[PDB]
Design an enzyme around this catalytic site. Structure first.
Site, PDB file in Angstrom:
ATOM      1  N   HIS A 157       2.221   6.315   2.474  1.00 42.51           N
ATOM      2  CA  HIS A 157       3.292   6.311   3.444  1.00 42.51           C
ATOM      3  C   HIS A 157       3.505   7.677   4.014  1.00 42.51           C
ATOM      4  O   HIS A 157       3.449   8.669   3.279  1.00 42.51           O
ATOM      5  CB  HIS A 157       4.567   5.836   2.802  1.00 42.51           C
ATOM      6  CG  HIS A 157       4.450   4.476   2.251  1.00 42.51           C
ATOM      7  ND1 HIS A 157       5.066   3.403   2.836  1.00 42.51           N
ATOM      8  CD2 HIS A 157       3.728   3.991   1.215  1.00 42.51           C
ATOM      9  CE1 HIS A 157       4.757   2.306   2.168  1.00 42.51           C
ATOM     10  NE2 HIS A 157       3.957   2.638   1.169  1.00 42.51           N
TER      11      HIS A 157
ATOM     12  N   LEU B  38       3.475   6.878  -3.745  1.00 37.13           N
ATOM     13  CA  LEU B  38       3.463   6.510  -2.353  1.00 37.13           C
ATOM     14  C   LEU B  38       2.727   7.524  -1.545  1.00 37.13           C
ATOM     15  O   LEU B  38       2.456   7.294  -0.377  1.00 37.13           O
ATOM     16  CB  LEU B  38       4.878   6.406  -1.810  1.00 37.13           C
ATOM     17  CG  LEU B  38       5.636   5.234  -2.408  1.00 37.13           C
ATOM     18  CD1 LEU B  38       6.899   5.145  -1.594  1.00 37.13           C
ATOM     19  CD2 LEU B  38       4.895   3.889  -2.437  1.00 37.13           C
TER      20      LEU B  38
ATOM     21  N   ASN C 286       5.482   0.632   5.591  1.00 38.48           N
ATOM     22  CA  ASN C 286       4.388   0.036   6.299  1.00 38.48           C
ATOM     23  C   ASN C 286       3.816  -1.196   5.624  1.00 38.48           C
ATOM     24  O   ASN C 286       4.257  -1.596   4.553  1.00 38.48           O
ATOM     25  CB  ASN C 286       3.326   1.097   6.522  1.00 38.48           C
ATOM     26  CG  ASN C 286       2.653   1.505   5.299  1.00 38.48           C
ATOM     27  OD1 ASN C 286       2.198   0.697   4.516  1.00 38.48           O
ATOM     28  ND2 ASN C 286       2.465   2.808   5.154  1.00 38.48           N
TER      29      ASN C 286
ATOM     30  N   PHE D  76      15.192   3.863  -6.742  1.00 37.99           N
ATOM     31  CA  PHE D  76      13.926   3.861  -6.015  1.00 37.99           C
ATOM     32  C   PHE D  76      14.133   4.320  -4.572  1.00 37.99           C
ATOM     33  O   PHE D  76      13.797   5.447  -4.212  1.00 37.99           O
ATOM     34  CB  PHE D  76      13.310   2.460  -6.072  1.00 37.99           C
ATOM     35  CG  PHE D  76      12.006   2.325  -5.358  1.00 37.99           C
ATOM     36  CD1 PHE D  76      11.247   3.425  -5.011  1.00 37.99           C
ATOM     37  CD2 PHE D  76      11.550   1.076  -5.022  1.00 37.99           C
ATOM     38  CE1 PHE D  76      10.058   3.278  -4.366  1.00 37.99           C
ATOM     39  CE2 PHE D  76      10.367   0.925  -4.369  1.00 37.99           C
ATOM     40  CZ  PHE D  76       9.615   2.036  -4.036  1.00 37.99           C
TER      41      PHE D  76
END
Length: 164
Positions: free
Chosen positions: A125, A121, A101, A59
């Protein structure tokens, strides 16, 4: 013209290797500059000596929490939080550098290095850079992670700065 910054990584204090990043200052200048400045420490604080507190193989490697060392701290060169600059760039695969975040417009200093494509994402992000050299080292850092992110040895940014 895009800045390059390096991290020299250590594992329980033992040097591992060097990772360098290209920062896409051309596209996310504000976000780029935050990371650049934290990597040089020119503002009096930054990443040097901080750890990667969360590493999930397959990841991402997350770091940048230089104040609480556990994903609850960090600050930007602009203050505690700054806005999401744009979502031009996508999490296209391993090597991508993006801001951690806690919600919209809460960027601080925590970032993650993707070790996979994380398209979910995208738009959430801010992507601002990519591994230029030493993807092998990021891959090496991955073996010290685990499924819940806890690292089996202490992964630290022993030194960091700007190559160009």
């Amino acid at each position: 013209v895009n800045p390059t910054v390096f991290f020299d990584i250590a594992v329980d204090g033992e040097p591992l290797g060097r990772v360098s990043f290209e920062l896409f200052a051309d596209k996310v200048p504000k976000t780029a500059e935050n990371f650049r400045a934290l990597s040089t420490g020119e503002k009096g604080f930054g990443y040097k000596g901080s750890c990667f507190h969360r590493i999930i193989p397959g990841f991402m490697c997350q770091g940048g929490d230089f104040t609480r060392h556990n994903g609850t701290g960090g600050k930007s060169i602009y203050g505690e939080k700054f806005e999401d600059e744009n979502f031009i760039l996508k999490h296209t695969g391993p090597g991508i550098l993006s801001m951690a975040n806690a919600g919209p417009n809460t960027n601080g200093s925590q970032f993650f290095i993707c070790t996979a494509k994380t398209e979910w994402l995208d738009g959430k992000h801010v992507v601002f850079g990519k591994v230029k050299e030493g993807m092998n080292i990021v891959e090496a850092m991955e073996r010290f992670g685990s499924r819940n992110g806890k690292t089996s040895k202490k992964i630290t940014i022993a030194d960091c700065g700007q190559l160009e």
